[PDB]
Each structure stands twice: as structure tokens, then as C-alpha cells.
Amino acid sequence: GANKTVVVTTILESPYVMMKKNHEMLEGNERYEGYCVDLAAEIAKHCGFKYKLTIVGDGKYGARDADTKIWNGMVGELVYGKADIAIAPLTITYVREEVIDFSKPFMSLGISIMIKKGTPIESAEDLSKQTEIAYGTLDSGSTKEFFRRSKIAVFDKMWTYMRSAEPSVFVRTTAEGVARVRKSKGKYAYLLESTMNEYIEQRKPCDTMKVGGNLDSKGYGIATPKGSSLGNAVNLAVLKLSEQGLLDKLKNKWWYDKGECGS
Amino acid sequence: GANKTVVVTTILESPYVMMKKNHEMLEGNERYEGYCVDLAAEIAKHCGFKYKLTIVGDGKYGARDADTKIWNGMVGELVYGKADIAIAPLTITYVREEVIDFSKPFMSLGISIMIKKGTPIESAEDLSKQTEIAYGTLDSGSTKEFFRRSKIAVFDKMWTYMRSAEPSVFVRTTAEGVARVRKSKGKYAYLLESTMNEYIEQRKPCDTMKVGGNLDSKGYGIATPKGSSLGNAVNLAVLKLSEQGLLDKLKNKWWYDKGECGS
Numbered sequence: 001g002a003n004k005t006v007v008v009t010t011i012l013e014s015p016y017v018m019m020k021k022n023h024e025m026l027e028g029n030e031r032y033e034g035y036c037v038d039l040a041a042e043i044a045k046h047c048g049f050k051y052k053l054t055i056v057g058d059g060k061y062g063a064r065d066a067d068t069k070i071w072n073g074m075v076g077e078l079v080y081g082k083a084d085i086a087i088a089p090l091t092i093t094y095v096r097e098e099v100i101d102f103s104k105p106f107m108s109l110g111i112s113i114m115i116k117k118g119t120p121i122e123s124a125e126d127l128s129k130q131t132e133i134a135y136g137t138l139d140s141g142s143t144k145e146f147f148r149r150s151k152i153a154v155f156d157k158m159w160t161y162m163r164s165a166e167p168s169v170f171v172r173t174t175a176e177g178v179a180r181v182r183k184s185k186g187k188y189a190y191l192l193e194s195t196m197n198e199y200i201e202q203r204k205p206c207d208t209m210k211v212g213g214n215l216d217s218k219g220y221g222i223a224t225p226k227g228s229s230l231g232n233a234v235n236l237a238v239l240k241l242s243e244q245g246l247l248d249k250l251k252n253k254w255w256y257d258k259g260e261c262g263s
Numbered sequence: 264g265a266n267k268t269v270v271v272t273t274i275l276e277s278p279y280v281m282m283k284k285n286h287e288m289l290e291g292n293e294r295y296e297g298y299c300v301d302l303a304a305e306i307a308k309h310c311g312f313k314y315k316l317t318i319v320g321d322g323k324y325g326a327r328d329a330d331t332k333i334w335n336g337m338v339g340e341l342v343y344g345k346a347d348i349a350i351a352p353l354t355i356t357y358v359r360e361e362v363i364d365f366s367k368p369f370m371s372l373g374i375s376i377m378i379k380k381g382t383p384i385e386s387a388e389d390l391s392k393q394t395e396i397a398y399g400t401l402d403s404g405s406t407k408e409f410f411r412r413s414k415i416a417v418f419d420k421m422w423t424y425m426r427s428a429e430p431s432v433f434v435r436t437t438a439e440g441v442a443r444v445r446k447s448k449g450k451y452a453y454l455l456e457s458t459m460n461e462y463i464e465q466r467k468p469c470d471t472m473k474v475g476g477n478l479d480s481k482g483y484g485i486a487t488p489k490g491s492s493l494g495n496a497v498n499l500a501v502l503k504l505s506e507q508g509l510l511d512k513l514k515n516k517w518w519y520d521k522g523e524c525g526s
């Protein structure tokens with residue numbers, strides 16, 4: 001049929017998608033700025049489509065409910081036909097690959113530890129062997145699933161603690177995790193992706209840091225409904241942008257070029 | 264060969280695929296050891312196929328001739344139907360993705376610089392600004408194509424030099440590039456992927472070093488002929504092995520430091 005506007009599901013997650021300063025008098029795609037906003041424009045240019053950025057309604061990345069088997073978040077939007085493509089920091093995982101298509105990765109990451117500066121913690125092993133400093137992850141994402149599924153002793157130990165910690169150590173958004181680290185006087189550490197960790201490390205008041213090596217190694221991919229015709233072109237577009245150095249340029253632009261914690 | 268036996272094309276490249284000690288009295292798959300030999304075993308178990316490891320006939324990764332437009336190397340073997348799958352440190356690139364299928368990446372890497380210890384070079388920029396120290400890359404691989412295509416000033420400058428350098432600065436195998444660094448008294452530097460650079464840096468005679476950051480960021484993938492029925496299962500197997508931590512285990516195993524260099 002005739003060309004239709006492509007519905008892009010994404011998520012309000014800095015610096016991937018953020019509200020522009022004058023958003024209150026702006027409409028459509030103009031309300032937003034960020035790494036994934038720039039990336040969406042580049043993909044659309046290369047693939048020759050018009051698009052509408054839509055923030056995922058439940059504000060989640062995507063998990064499948066164990067009982068109802070229903071997918072939420074951006075994955076749900078794709079699975080249930082509410083969106084045509086997801087352009088966001090969406091982790092390529094086994095369970096998601098079974099239900100949606102992913103491009104080759106546009107960005108690499110690993111789960112990492114965020115602490116308030118001066119917290120006596122250097123590693124996951126350190127966290128697991130003490131009880132004074134609480135720690136948790138984002139809900140409905142690939143990091144929580146990592147711990148839940150791990151058969152590695154240290155990560156299994158951390159999961160056993162986290163899953164039953166009171167009050168809850170899990171947060172609904174990254175911003176909530178960041179606030180908890182910053183306000184807890186060193187008594188909360190946050191488990192999140194190195195990409196987000198490194199970004200926050202560059203934001204005022206410069207009181208957090210990434211500590212230790214990454215716990216794993218993986219990638220974000222652009223997602224489409226399983227068997228979507230858009231998938232092949234989008235995948236080539238990612239590889240082309242990668243090889244032109246444009247992904248490197250976008251990362252530097254949004255993470256470091258206007259970092260607030262110095263040069 | 265036997266029916267239902269998958270023909271695996273691969274390449275002799277340490278520590279991905281190497282000849283075992285006493286291999287001349289060994290037979291079939293038992294002749295070889297290495298990261299990709301182990302990976303092939305795990306992939307085949309997860310997908311339920313028997314397989315035959317074969318070393319690519321021309322010893323090349325794969326490039327398309329500009330005039331004939333014939334593909335050589337492991338890419339050629341998939342393209343012309345001589346192999347069913349490639350399991351090797353084969354870089355996922357735009358031009359290859361157009362002609363073969365790739366799994367999501369099983370290993371990350373970037374182009375990097377290898378010098379003989381003490382060589383006064385700290386970066387690609389340094390290399391481009393001088394003429395005393397020659398430098399080159401592997402023939403018929405993604406590193407050579409990277410420089411050939413780059414619009415980035417420094418890399419553009421390096422390509423202009425390398426393409427006309429005499430005697431040739433290009434080598435047929437990584438081993439020869441390494442030997443050339445070692446024997447050239449600091450007058451040759453070698454551009455190669457960070458994975459191989461780091462392996463060599465830990466091996467005797469401990470006389471080479473990686474300098475500077477990686478020049479790019481990419482991934483190795485398992486490749487199959489376009490539209491091969493093996494593709495989907497192999498891709499899910501890579502993601503499963505990734506999430507179980509088995510790829511990390513294999514990396515630690517074959518990049519294991521016995522302390523040939525220092526403590």
C-alpha cells in the first residue's frame with residue numbers, strides 16, 4: 001500500500017530521549033532531543049520513511065509476566081502491534097529475540113555498579129559479602145532478569161538478597177535509582193547498564209561513579225515486530241552508520257561533549 | 264561428505280583456531296584447538312548438528328574483488344556454497360551483511376595498533392604525522408577495508424600512505440604482521456583487531472604492545488549463507504551462550520595469562 005507514518009516506540013531515558021526546553025509549546029517529534037532522537041532521524045533518512053516518536057505508555061523496557069505471559073513495555077508495544085519499531089536503549093536478549101526482531105547492536109554495554117562517591121565498595125563480590133549497603137536494579141528490564149536467571153554463585157547470592165529485601169530495592173525508572181544513591185549517604189548502590197552509569201557520572205552534582213568491571217557484555221539493538229519488512233533495511237542502516245563513525249559521534253555528543261563535570 | 268553433516272569453514276588464527284601439538288597424527292576435528300573450536304562444539308550441541316571443521320582454502324577472511332566482483336576467503340566459501348557456516352573471528356560489516364547472514368555478535372573488538380616495545384608512537388594520529396615508522400594491515404579483511412573507506416581525516420591520511428607504500432606494508436596473515444613488527448627494530452607498526460593484539464601482548468617474547476584506544480568498535484558474528492535454515496537456531500545459541508556466561512569463560516580460557524610476561 002501507500003507509505004504510512006512509522007510509529008516509533010521509545011522511552012524517556014536520558015540522554016537517549018529527553019524533553020526539550022521549550023517542549024510545552026512544541027508538538028510531535030520536536031518535543032524531544034537526545035541520542036535516540038538523533039539516531040531515529042538518521043535511520044529514517046537512510047531507510048526513507050516518515051515517523052512519529054511515541055513514549056511507551058507504561059514507561060517500561062519490557063518483561064513477560066510469568067503467569068499471564070503478557071509482555072509489557074516497549075517489547076509489548078511491538079508484540080501487540082501498537083508500534084512499528086523501537087528505537088531506544090533496548091537490550092538484545094534471548095527471550096526477547098524469540099518474540100521480536102533486532103538489528104545488529106548499535107551500542108555496547110554491561111551491567112555495572114553505581115555508588116555515591118566514597119562508598120567502600122569495589123565490586124559485585126564486595127556488595128554480596130556485606131549487609132550494610134543495600135542494592136537493587138530497575139524493574140521490567142534486562143538487568144533484573146540477569147540476576148534472576150544467573151547460575152553464577154555471586155550473582156545468585158545478590159539475587160537471593162535483592163528479591164526479598166525490605167523495603168524494596170527495585171526502582172521504576174533510572175532517575176529513581178540515581179536519586180536513591182544520591183540521597184542514601186552511601187547506604188544504597190544501584191545496578192545499571194554501564195552506558196547510563198557513565199552518563200550520570202558526567203552530570204551535576206558529580207557525586208556518583210562507576211566502580212568495578214562490567215558484570216557482563218551485551219548490546220542495544222533496534223527492534224521491530226517479528227518478520228517486519230522494515231527489519232533488513234534498518235539493520236543495514238545501523239551497520240552503515242556504525243562504519244561511518246556516526247554512532248561514535250553521537251555517543252560523544254550526548255555523553256561527553258556537554259558533560260557537566262569538567263574535561 | 265556424510266548427509267546431515269554441517270561443513271564449518273574457519274581460519275588458522277591464534278587463539279581462535281590452532282593446530283594441536285602432534286596434530287600430524289590426529290584426524291578430522293581433533294586436529295584443532297581454540298576459542299572457535301570450543302564455540303563450534305557448543306553451538307553444534309545447542310542446535311543438534313554434527314559438523315566438519317575445514318580450514319578455508321585460501322587462508323583469507325573475505326573480500327570482494329573490485330573488477331571480477333568475486334568474493335574470496337570464508338565469505339566466498341559461504342557465498343559459493345562450499346561451506347554451510349563460518350565460525351571464526353569474522354567481522355560483521357555492511358558489505359558482508361549484504362551477501363551473507365550473521366548471528367548477533369559473540370565477541371566485541373576494535374582496530375588497534377601494535378608496536379614493538381619502545382616505539383615512539385602513542386596513537387593513530389602519531390602514525391599519520393611521520394614517515395620513519397612504516398605501518399600496514401592484513402590483506403582481504405575488514406581492517407584494510409576500514410581504512411580504504413574512511414572519511415575521517417587521520418584514517419584517510421593513513422590509507423593514502425599505506426596504499427602506495429613500497430615495499431608493501433600489507434601482510435597475508437596476522438602471524439606475518441606480528442613477525443614483521445618484531446623483526447623491524449621499531450620501524451614497522453601493525454594495525455590489527457584488539458582481540459588478537461591483546462593475545463599476542465601476553466605471549467613470549469613479550470616484545471610487543473598495544474597503544475592508544477581502539478580506532479573503532481565492532482563485533483564478530485557467526486555467518487551462514489543468505490537465507491540458510493541454520494541461521495535462526497545459531498543466533499539463539501549465541502545469545503544463550505552469552506547469557507549463561509560461557510562466552511566470557513571461553514575468552515578467559517584462551518586469553519589465559521600464565522605469566523610468560525612479568526609476574
Ligand SMILES: O=C(c1ccc2nccnc2c1)N1CCCCC1
Pocket residue numbers: 105106107108109217218219220367368369370371372480481482483505510
Ligand atoms: O552485542 C555485543 C556487541 C559487540 C560489539 C559491539 N560493537 C559496537 C556496538 N555494540 C556492540 C555490541 N556483545 C559483546 C560481546 C559478547 C556478546 C555481546
Ligand SMILES: N[C@@H](CCC(=O)O)C(=O)O
Pocket residue numbers: 061062089090091138140141142143144191192193
Ligand atoms: N536496557 C535495559 C533497561 C535497563 C536495565 O535493565 O538496567 C532493557 O532493555 O531492559
Ligand SMILES: N[C@@H](CCC(=O)O)C(=O)O
Pocket residue numbers: 324325352353354355401403404405406407454455456
Ligand atoms: N576480523 C577481520 C580479519 C582481521 C583484520 O582484518 O584485521 C575480518 O573478518 O576480515
Ligand SMILES: [Cl-]
Pocket residue numbers: 003004005
Ligand atoms: Cl500515515
Ligand SMILES: [Cl-]
Pocket residue numbers: none
Ligand atoms: Cl543448556
Ligand SMILES: [Cl-]
Pocket residue numbers: none
Ligand atoms: Cl593514484
